[PDB]
């Protein structure tokens, strides 16, 4: 009833990486090592990255979700507030209700789980291509944190599965996320406050 969030990094060596994007107040997207947190705007592209110490099988899929990060809210799904579900943003592939997608790529796929009802995105992992060291996705996030009747305050997780053709767990990676007016201000904040404790 709760996706795991262990690392994992398995037989090919999976973590993510994130750009050095700096926190001027401008900033849309911005990543931060000590808090293991992505700020970003609402529907902005995000760019993370997938390294591999070996390439992994054709037919290799990634496939990101959100769970809410406080344990007394891990079984709710995370999903678009009402407004947003409601909003006509649709890009053709994403289903409204689906806080994360994958944009620019044709292959996203879009999951509502039979059995648990949760919302995932995954496309196929491909290799870097020629002179590139890894390979990178963009993803949107179509909430704010503080949507109400969505996130409503709650952080959130990310988890980033590397999987087999049948869906099989081959590594795993994860990050806290808060969409946000002003990612660049809110990173320093919390940066500020994880120092002073
Ligand atoms: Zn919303």
New binding site residues.
Partial sequence: SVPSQKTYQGSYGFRLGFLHSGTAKSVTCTYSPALNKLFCQ?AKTCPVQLWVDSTPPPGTRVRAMAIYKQSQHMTEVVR??????RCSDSDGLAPPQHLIRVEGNLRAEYLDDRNTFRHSVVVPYEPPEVGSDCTTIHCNY???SS?????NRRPILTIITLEDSSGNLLGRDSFEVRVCACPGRDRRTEEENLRKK
């Fill in positions: 609402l678009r507030c009402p407004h947003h579900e179509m909430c704010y949507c109400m009747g969505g996130m």
